[PDB]
Every structure is written in structure tokens, then in C-alpha cells.
Amino acid sequence: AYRDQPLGELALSIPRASALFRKYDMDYAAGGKQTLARAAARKELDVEVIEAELAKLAEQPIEKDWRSAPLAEIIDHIIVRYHDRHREQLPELILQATKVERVHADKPSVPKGLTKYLTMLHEELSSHMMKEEQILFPMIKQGMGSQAMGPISVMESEHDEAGELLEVIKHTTNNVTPPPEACTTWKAMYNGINELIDDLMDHISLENNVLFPRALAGE
Ligand SMILES: [O]
Ligand SMILES: [Zn+2]
Ligand SMILES: [Zn+2]
């Protein structure tokens, strides 16, 4: 009965359900408590079609269940797979945007402002990830999460803010769709933005749907 399960649960139990949700712009990362039925109702989408899509994906076995992994292992994975990867992706994308805005400034379809908006995202992310790595994650590792509800809600507010900056980047790039005039840098950059959105959503999902709720529950 997938329509009745929360998005976050579905994304964690069905391999690549996250990619299905991305296609429909369903926020499983910050909106993970919503039922699929609700999220579908909000978007005016046929849930039965989405349920069939999920059933086909569930045919693949699941590769690794983060729902049961120890919190310290989740944290080290976040740092290596997501935090450090964002520290490399974003500056690359900023450089590519700088060049595109420079060279194609006079094309009517150029994504004007993209360099600044990627830089804003990068700046918010850098300070956010440092708070996590230096202050919050160490306390969660020592089993102190159930006394950290204040801090954790602050981090979830910051995840929501990063979500808003993603929407701005989407808006500036026509939902990350290159015009017919785009060169290979411009196309590659848009592919990299999509990759960044994928990773960021999986990163935030892992924190909002697994790490933080388990830590608050006393792990
Ligand atoms: O994060
Ligand atoms: Zn993080
Ligand atoms: Zn975070």
C-alpha cells in the first residue's frame, strides 16, 4: 500500500525511489514525513501510476540499509560521500558558471545570476557542514542526541534554506534545461547541477529521515 507510506520511508526502503521522486519534484528529503498519497495529491499526479513505478524498482534488491546502521557509520559516510563531495562539486560548477556568463553574456537564454546563486549555496553549505562536523556530529557519536533537539531543529531549518536556494538555481536555469544554443561547458554544467541536486537531496534525506530521528530517539 505504497500511497500510505511516508516518502522518507519509501526512499530508504526502495532502491532508486529517490530518483523517481526527483522526477516528480517530490521533496522526500525535507518533506519526508508526508505520505506518498498527499505528495501526489499536492502535485496533481496519478498515485496508482507512481505505485506501479515503485513496484518495478522494488524488484531490485536493496544495496545497503542505512536505517539499521550505527550512527557513527552514517556520520562518517555523510562526511566522505556527501560533505567532501559538495566541497569539490560546487566550486567546479561556480567556475563553469563564471565562464558561461562571461562568454555567453549576450545570448538571451544565458542564466544570468547563476554564479552568484551557486556561490550563495556554497557559502550556506560550508558553514552548515562545519557546524555539523565540529559540534553536532561529535555529540551524536557520543549518544547525546536525545538532549540535542534544539540544535537538530536548527539544522533542519538550514536544510530547508538550502532547498530554497536549489529552487532559485532551478528557476534561473529553466529547470536545469539547456537551450539549443548551449555549448559543451554549458551542457556539462547543467548535468553537474542535476548531479549536485541528486546528492544534496540524498544527503539531506539521510540526515532528516535517518540520522536525526534516530539520535533524538536515544541512539
Ligand atoms: O548537511
Ligand atoms: Zn550534512
Ligand atoms: Zn545538514
SS3 143: coil
Residue 159 carries which side chain, given as an amino acid letter?
Answer: H
What distance in angstroms lies between residue 105's CA and the mean position of ligand 1's atoms? 33
CA of 204 to the centre of ligand 1 (A): 6
Q: Say if ligand 1 is within 6 A of residue 86 CB.
A: no
Nearest CA among 219, 201, 199, 197 for reference residue 67 = 219
Largest pairwise CA distance in the chain: 56
Q: How far apart are CA 211 and CA 219, in angstroms?
A: 9
CB of 99 within 8 A of CB of 115?
no
DSSP 8-state symbol, 81: I
Judge contact between 43 and 219, C-beta under 8 A: no
CA 158 to ligand 3 centroid distance, Å: 7
Question: In angstroms, how far is CA 193 from the centroid of its own chain?
Answer: 11
CA nearest neighbour of 11 among 172, 163, 189, 23: 23
Indicate which residue's Cα is closest to atom 1 of ligand 1.
Answer: 129
Residue 164, number of CB atoms within 10 A of its CB? 12
Distance of CA 205 from the midpoint of ligand 3 (Å) = 9
Please give the tally of structural domains in the chain.
1
Domain that holds residue 8: 1-219
Q: Nearest Cα to 208, choosing from 143, 117, 132, 147?
A: 132
Compute the radius of gyration of the chain from its Cα atoms. Answer: 18
Amino acid in the structure at residue 28 = Y
Distance CA 173, CA 187 (A): 11
Those residues whose C-beta lies under 8 Å from the C-beta of residue 75, and which sit 6 or more positions away, are 137, 140, 141, 211
**Cell of residue 187, nine digits:** 551542457
3-state secondary structure of 62: coil
> How far is C-alpha 178 from the chain's CA centre?
21
CA distance 117 to 139: 32
Instruction: Determine if ligand 1 sits within 6 Å of the CB of residue 132.
Output: yes
- Rounded to whole angstroms, how far apart are CA atoms 10 and 179? 34
Question: 129 in ligand 1 pocket by Cβ < 6 Å?
Answer: yes
* 56 CA distance to ligand 3 middle (Å): 31
Determine the Cα–Cα distance for residues 159 and 204; give it in Å rounded to an integer.
7
By three-state DSSP, how is residue 219 classified?
coil
**Cβ-count burial 20-49 (b if 16+ within 10 Å, e if not):** bbbeeebbbbbbbebbbbbbbeeeeeebee
Tell me how long the chain is: 219
Q: Is 35 helix (H, G, I), strand (E, B) or coil?
A: strand
Beta bridge partners of 35: 6
Query: Per residue in 139-159, is it b (16+ CB within 10 Å) or e — as a string?
Result: ebbeeebeebeebbeebeebb
Instruction: Pinpoint the alpha helices (H) of the chain.
Output: 7-13, 17-23, 36-43, 47-58, 71-77, 84-103, 114-131, 137-141, 149-172, 184-206, 212-216
